[PDB]
Design an enzyme around this catalytic site. Structure first.
Site, short mmCIF file in Angstrom:
data_model
loop_
_atom_site.label_atom_id
_atom_site.label_comp_id
_atom_site.label_asym_id
_atom_site.label_seq_id
_atom_site.Cartn_x
_atom_site.Cartn_y
_atom_site.Cartn_z
N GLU A 35 0.82 -1.19 0.00
CA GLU A 35 0.00 0.00 0.00
C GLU A 35 0.87 1.25 0.00
O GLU A 35 0.38 2.35 -0.28
CB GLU A 35 -0.96 -0.01 1.19
CG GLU A 35 -2.06 -1.06 1.09
CD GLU A 35 -3.16 -0.67 0.11
OE1 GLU A 35 -2.84 -0.02 -0.91
OE2 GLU A 35 -4.33 -1.02 0.36
N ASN A 46 -7.82 8.96 -6.53
CA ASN A 46 -8.92 8.12 -6.96
C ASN A 46 -9.83 8.78 -7.97
O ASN A 46 -9.87 10.00 -8.12
CB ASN A 46 -9.75 7.67 -5.76
CG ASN A 46 -9.15 6.50 -5.04
OD1 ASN A 46 -9.32 5.35 -5.45
ND2 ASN A 46 -8.44 6.78 -3.95
N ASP A 48 -12.59 8.58 -7.47
CA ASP A 48 -13.62 8.80 -6.49
C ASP A 48 -13.46 10.20 -5.91
O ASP A 48 -13.96 10.49 -4.84
CB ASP A 48 -13.52 7.78 -5.35
CG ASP A 48 -12.23 7.95 -4.57
OD1 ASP A 48 -11.68 9.08 -4.60
OD2 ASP A 48 -11.78 6.98 -3.95
N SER A 50 -10.73 11.74 -4.77
CA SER A 50 -9.79 11.86 -3.66
C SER A 50 -8.60 10.93 -3.85
O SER A 50 -8.63 10.02 -4.67
CB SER A 50 -10.46 11.61 -2.32
OG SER A 50 -9.61 12.01 -1.26
N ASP A 52 -5.53 8.43 -1.79
CA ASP A 52 -5.14 7.86 -0.48
C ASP A 52 -3.87 8.65 -0.23
O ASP A 52 -3.45 9.27 -1.24
CB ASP A 52 -4.90 6.35 -0.51
CG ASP A 52 -6.15 5.51 -0.22
OD1 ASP A 52 -7.11 6.04 0.37
OD2 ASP A 52 -6.16 4.31 -0.59
N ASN A 59 -7.47 6.95 2.82
CA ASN A 59 -8.27 7.96 2.08
C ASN A 59 -8.62 9.23 2.89
O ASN A 59 -9.19 9.18 3.97
CB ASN A 59 -9.53 7.35 1.48
CG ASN A 59 -10.29 8.36 0.64
OD1 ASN A 59 -11.52 8.41 0.66
ND2 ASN A 59 -9.55 9.19 -0.10
#
Length: 128
Positions: A35, A46, A48, A50, A52, A59
């Protein structure tokens, strides 16, 4: 920044992460390449709305602030930034508290992808 595995992993020991909620640090270590790949400044945006962040690759919209994410919570009430630092401990300190939730490493499925069911001491050995 980007930290060397061992050079970095006995650092978690310093944070006692090892056995943080029964979690062996190797499992922690892992999540970092998986990660974080152990890159401090690595950050993944993302589709999405945003990214991480940090090495932790957690996030923002739920944890940090970079003042960017519509409707974000930043329950960490901190800078999204302060984590990708060449000294992750901070993010760690927040990441660690974030595990206080029921889900556990689960929140990094990447973990469950890799780090889950895997030999986590495979990290520990041959490094002091």
């Amino acid at each position: 920044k980007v930290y060397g595995r061992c050079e970095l992993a006995a650092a978690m020991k310093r944070l006692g992460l090892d056995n943080y909620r029964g979690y062996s640090l190797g499992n922690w270590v892992c999540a970092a390449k998986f990660e974080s790949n152990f890159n401090t400044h690595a950050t993944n945006r993302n589709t999405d709305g945003s990214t991480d962040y940090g090495i932790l690759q957690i996030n923002s919209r739920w944890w940090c602030n970079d003042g960017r994410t519509p409707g974000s919570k930043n329950l960490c009430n901190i800078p999204c930034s302060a984590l990708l630092s060449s000294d992750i401990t901070a993010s760690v300190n927040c990441a660690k508290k974030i595990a206080s939730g029921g889900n556990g490493m689960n929140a990094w499925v990447a973990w469950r992808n890799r780090c889950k069911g895997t030999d986590v001491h495979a990290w520990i050995r041959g490094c002091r």
